[PDB]
Amino acid sequence: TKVKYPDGFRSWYHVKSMVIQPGHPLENPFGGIHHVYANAEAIQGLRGGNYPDGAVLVFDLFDYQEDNHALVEGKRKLIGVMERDAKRFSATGGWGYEGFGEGKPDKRLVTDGGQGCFGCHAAQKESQYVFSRLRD
């Protein structure tokens, strides 16, 4: 009943990126440059189909440094993970929610079985609880 670490996620498909700066309500703790990646199964949900079991989205969050008005990636703060399993993750709408401190497998951040994540992600019920959209 626990989200698997997504080995190899960095070689997956880059869906989009976004910068959250100090002052944004999500500053704590999602401030930084983030990138979104999807495995093959997730791409099919993003492309319009149903999300099948085994679908995985990753939120890869980096700290950054203003240097002469360029934003430069520094150290990874965390990764957030959504793993699709309609049965096993029934409780949180078919996705399991987990965090890994610094992207390391041994550093789970979620302490409430994922209801905090789901609390906010539920507003996107219309789109299967995913906020990101494929762009070209």
Interaction of residue 64 with ligand HEC, rule CB under 6 A: no
Which of 27, 28, 10 has the alpha carbon at shortest distance from 19? 27
Interaction pattern, residues 11-50, with its own copies; x per rule: CB under 8 A: x-xx-xxxxxxxxxxxx-----x-x-x-------------
Q: Which stretch binds ligand HEC (CB under 6 A): 6-14, 43-51, 53-61, 84-92?
A: 53-61
- Minimum Å distance from CB 37 to ligand HEC? 9
3-state secondary structure of 126: helix
Which of 47, 43, 134 has the alpha carbon at shortest distance from 84? 43
Which of 21, 46, 48, 45 has the alpha carbon at shortest distance from 33? 21
Position 32, amino acid: G
| DSSP code, position 93 | T
What dihedral do alpha carbons 39, 45, 49, 52 form, nearest 10°? 70
Task: Kindly state the number of chain residues that form the binding site for Zn ion, as judged by CB under 5 A.
Answer: 1
Interaction of residue 22 with Zn ion, rule CB under 5 A: no
Interaction of residue 130 with ligand HEC, rule CB under 6 A: yes
Residues making contact with ligand HEC (CB under 6 A): 16, 18, 34, 36, 57-59, 80-82, 97-99, 110, 116-117, 120-121, 130-132
Please report, in range form, the residues annotated as the binding site for Zn(2+): 27, 66, 69
